[PDB]
Amino acid sequence: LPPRPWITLKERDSASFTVMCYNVLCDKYATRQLYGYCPSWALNWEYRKKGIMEEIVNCDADIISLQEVETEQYFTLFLPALKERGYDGFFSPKSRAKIMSEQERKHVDGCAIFFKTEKFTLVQKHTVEFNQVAMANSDGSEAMLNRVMTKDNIGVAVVLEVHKELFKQLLIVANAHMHWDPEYSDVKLIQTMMFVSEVKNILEKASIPLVLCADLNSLPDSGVVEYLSNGGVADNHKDFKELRYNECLMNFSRITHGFQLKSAYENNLMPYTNYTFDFKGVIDYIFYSKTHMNVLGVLGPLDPQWLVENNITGCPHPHIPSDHFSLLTQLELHP
Ligand SMILES: Nc1ccn([C@@H]2O[C@H](COP(=O)(O)O)[C@@H](O)[C@H]2O)c(=O)n1
């Protein structure tokens, strides 16, 4: 497996730091039924976690956003190992409000944000529960209650002090993992607007640059990517499927947001971020405040001719420990 190439897009000169975004594929979902093309010994977590930790250590990012972090693995694998690489972290599982056994609680996955303490100091941490926010804004929309409220997905966000020696400067890093089902573009879009409007509220109770990492489960042509990329979306966008023109959506505000985000990866520089037999596409993203930061570089994709040479039609694989590829970008923050 050849190393992935680092790409220089723009020359330095402010502070520069790297951000990784990575869905590690949790053990619960790494099954023969979903990934029958991958041998069971290569799906097993005691094997796969080595490649996952290797990928994270090699990327060596100043800030790390992970999805599908299982609760117990956060406390016994990721955080203890990354603490030795100079990180602290913030984790939150999905499904905190759901009743379940002690054993099941250990295996619920969530989102984690790690940051190197020599460069950042955590000032606030927050968990955004999409089901609670949907429920609180569901008046007059059966679809909000039936379709959006019933999905357990979350995002997390931290407010960080960017240390002066990298140049009281603050940055917000947000990390979310949206509902997956392709028949539910309305849920994905509403979850995205809910997350962005709740992050905006985090600002006020604290303008400030944003780095938004997420497994959006949304292709680049989607309503969520347009919403994140153009600062808003019409309320009658087709991804709402009806109720398009519903008034409850304006609570998250045409529905607009004041951020001015661009994607760190822009022109299918990676042709996909999720790579399985049945589905290949870009559904993972790193967005940043374009009026505050430049992109100085990104980590290019795994050489596709190698995947071709080795007849690899889906991941994970004995030498690729997730069905997602990591995203890694170096940003340059300007006061
Ligand atoms: N537009 C989209 C986005 C995701 N998906 C499905 O969701 C899967 C991704 O799941 P996760 O991102 O939650 O791991 C894909 O492999 C695919 O089966 C889809 O079928 N259509």
Curated annotation (Swiss-Prot):
Self-association and partners: Component of the CCR4-NOT complex; distinct complexes seem to exist that differ in the participation of probably mutually exclusive catalytic subunits; the complex contains two deadenylase subunits, CNOT6 or CNOT6L, and CNOT7 or CNOT8. Interacts with CNOT1, CNOT3, CNOT7, CNOT8 and CNOT9. Interacts with TOB1. Interacts with NANOS2. Interacts with ZFP36. Interacts with ZFP36L2. Interacts with RBM46.
CC cofactor: Mg(2+)
Record EC number: 3.1.13.4
Protein name per Swiss-Prot or TrEMBL: CCR4-NOT transcription complex subunit 6-like
Annotated positions binding Mg(2+) 1: 68
Binding site for Mg(2+) 2: 215
Result when mutating residue 182 to A: Decreased deadenylase activity
Activity modulation notes: Inhibited by free AMP, and with lesser efficiency also by CMP, GMP, UMP, ATP and neomycin.
Residues of the full protein shown: 169 to 540 of 555
Active-site residues from the entry: 215
Annotated residues for binding of substrate: 68, 104, 177, 182, 217, 274, 279
Subcellular localization, as worded in the UniProt entry: Cytoplasm; Nucleus
Keyword rRNA-binding on entry: no
One GO MF term attached to the UniProt entry: metal ion binding
Gene this chain is encoded by: CNOT6L
Effect of residue 324 to A: Loss of deadenylase activity
Main localization of the protein described in the UniProt heading: cytoplasm
Tissue-level expression: Highly expressed in placenta, skeletal muscle, pancreas, testis and leukocytes. Weakly expressed in heart, spleen and thymus.
Record's cofactor remark: Binds 2 magnesium ions, but the ions interact each with only 1 or 2 residues.
Lineage: Eukaryota, Metazoa, Chordata, Craniata, Vertebrata
Catalytic activity: Exonucleolytic cleavage of poly(A) to 5'-AMP
GO biological process: mRNA processing; nuclear-transcribed mRNA poly(A) tail shortening; positive regulation of cell population proliferation; positive regulation of cytoplasmic mRNA processing body assembly; regulation of translation; regulatory ncRNA-mediated gene silencing
